[PDB]
Amino acid sequence: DNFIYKAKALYPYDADDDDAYEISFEQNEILQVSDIEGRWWKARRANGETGIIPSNYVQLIDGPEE
């Protein structure tokens, strides 16, 4: 449903240019995430960047929130 969560990156990730729906992030960066039922999650960075992320690279730290 509508829930958003907060995740902390355990490691950096560099998205490929070839798969242009992924986003990169830094180790210890806090991300807002949703659609966490599967392996690739929807993320938003503080800078407004939006895309999908590998869920094994992050840890859930807060949520759910409406």
Binding site: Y11, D19, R39
Partner: peptide, 9 residues
């Protein structure tokens, strides 16, 4: 799509 391997620990 498979998940990437975790980096070096």
């Amino acid at each position: 799509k498979p998940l990437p391997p975790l980096p070096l620990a």
